[PDB]
Design a protein around this ligand. Sequence first.
Ligand code: T3X
Length: 787
Amino acid sequence: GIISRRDVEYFKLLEKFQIALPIGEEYLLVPSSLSDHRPVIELPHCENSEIIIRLYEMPYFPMGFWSRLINRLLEISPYMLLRPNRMYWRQGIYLNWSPEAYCLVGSEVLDNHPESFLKITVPSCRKGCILLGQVVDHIDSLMEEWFPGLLEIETLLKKWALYSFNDGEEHQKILLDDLMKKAEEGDLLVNPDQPRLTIPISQIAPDLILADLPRNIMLNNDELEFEQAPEFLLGDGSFGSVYRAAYEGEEVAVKIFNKHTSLRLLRQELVVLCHLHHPSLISLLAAGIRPRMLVMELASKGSLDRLLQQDKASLTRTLQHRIALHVADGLRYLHSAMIIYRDLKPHNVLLFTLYPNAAIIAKIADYGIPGFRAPEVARGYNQQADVYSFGLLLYDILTTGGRIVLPDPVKEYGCAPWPMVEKLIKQCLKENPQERPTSAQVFDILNSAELVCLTRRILLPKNVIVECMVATHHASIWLGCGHTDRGQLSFLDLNTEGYTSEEVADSRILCLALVHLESWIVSGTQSGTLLVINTEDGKHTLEKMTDSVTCLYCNFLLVGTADGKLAIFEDKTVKLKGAAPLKILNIGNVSTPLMCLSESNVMWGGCGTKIFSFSNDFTIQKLIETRTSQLFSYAAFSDSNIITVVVDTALYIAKQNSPVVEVWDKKTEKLCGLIDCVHFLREVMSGRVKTLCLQKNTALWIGTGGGHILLLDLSTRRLIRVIYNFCNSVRVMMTAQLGSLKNVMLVLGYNREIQSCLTVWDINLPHEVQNLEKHIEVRKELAEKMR
Ligand SMILES: Cc1ccc(C(=O)Nc2ccc(CN3CCN(C)CC3)c(C(F)(F)F)c2)cc1C#Cc1cnc2[nH]ncc2c1
């Protein structure tokens, strides 16, 4: 019946309907028209004491039983804890690795017995015990799943173990139920007529004592301090018969299979557990038969369902993200092994620590022992149903309480916004299973520090573009717009998203500043008018500048004009109409606009291609011509006007249309280094620098014209991260306060008719990137170590 693949070559359907059943080496089984007889098999051993014989007496073989059985047994291996010499018949299969590892499963007929028999013969060794365990597990699973009713009341199905007291005698039979009772009564089978003739109950039925367990899984009863009492019940009724106990000095959870059809459920759960080695799944420590027992690791902090209602204060954003990441990792692990977690809910998620930075926080458990079902599950599993269950779990994690005690999580429960988690919840809850992401995709989405550190994403009205923005030093943003010839001043409320606007100037508003005394906002427009508007009262003008006001800084107020001039006002001066600046001075010329200013005190500034510096005297101290960096940079980049200067210990200079950020020494006035943004972007796959912002906690934020954010570590200037997929062009970037001591970075980006957006990032984004990468590496190392 064996047919080569090339002689037949769809195949998945052939496997489904028991047509192909691939063997290996491009060979198909095709049970139909096989040898139909026993092809003379001589076993390595022929004595009673060297073999184990297990008999299944049945009234008949069900149709399709042997084909499915052989398909199941084709994958057996004693090393799954050499290539076998496989042989096939229609009703049987023979495997042979070695004289110490073989398995003969085949049909059998007794004299004067109409009933059919299935005989399993293995060597009397550990490998033979493992093979026997696998074979009987496969047979029992097959009968449970494909042929129910042959098991219930029995149904003339009997299981026998064949034994003898002396080599050379004929095998006697004992039912597995009677032998199971004797196994609890003792460890020996006794000849009723001659007590002197004794055999071990094991090694004729070694699967009844779990002798095929891995060496590290066998119970050491000398190390187990376990008492079965309701005082030690775990979850005062939950989790079923789960008890607290001590094993090898550590507190563990103990599941009891007593008072039921034990050694079938226990063996099934062992078959499931022993091949699952994953950091996100609860780990099996031991198993036993004296009481039918599973000993697993104990979760110190209980389950997630109890935490979501009792200790809501502990659910920080980092802890929630780590719990979600661990659960998604566990689901990916289960789905990669073709294993389905049917019912996932907060009750099934165990917590080991509440420390957000721990390597292991959450694990998935399925104890013994509704509204957490996919529509196709509720109406009627599938991996998409598990993805839907994970979406529900992530919704429950995101919301404070709610369902555990769908509508929009933020409006209904308060639930401070988590923009990139709500999108994942929406994707995971799609009704059509084929549109839902896979568990690997879900984990890949959650494995992103952009997901953690993205706090808000506010979208402005269409075709309204914003030239400048300034935040009140107190979640209120003033915007100077330029989508018109008459400049407009807008106000955006970042707590309750709300946009208002008003036209205040004849020309576009190029820059904004806040003067705090009373508080006022100075708008510098293209015509040069400095329009000072009260921040509490509605809509003064200061002395008009000779050209466009290109920068405003605010102590004093500094007005850098496009004419290369710097005007200096006192805070009390700007309060009155038409007041002249305290000073005016020339650093550049008509063609060299004063385009940036910064503080570090000493006031640095960038005008044309020059870095100028000044102290309280308002006189120029240092003039550094950056043009010379053409010797190290490219000429067209170093000849461009400086658009922003950032100073902490060295000057960081960005130039117009230039993808290179220059680093200059404050003391020697010499070029310290160059940062090539195109080089960094090519590692991920424009580069022109538009914004340049500094985080004092060791980070440089570079906004590019292609909508990317380069996070650099200003120590050897290594690349921390590249953030993207949020806009098409970064236009403004600045640090701000949203209240409640929340430090944020506001990125005004563009989605180009034109859709401009304001994105809020947590100030600890580089630290979160590094921490998440280290966490993922540690978890990967753990998964590799577990095998
Ligand atoms: C004592 C105990 C025994 C067993 C388990 C267990 O989960 N077993 C288990 C079984 C199956 C599966 C996977 N199957 C595959 C297909 N199936 C259809 C679906 C899933 C999983 C896997 F994990 F792989 F999904 C785990 C947990 C505990 C426990 C405990 C404990 C520990 N500490 C605690 N503290 N408070 C309470 C508490 C409770």
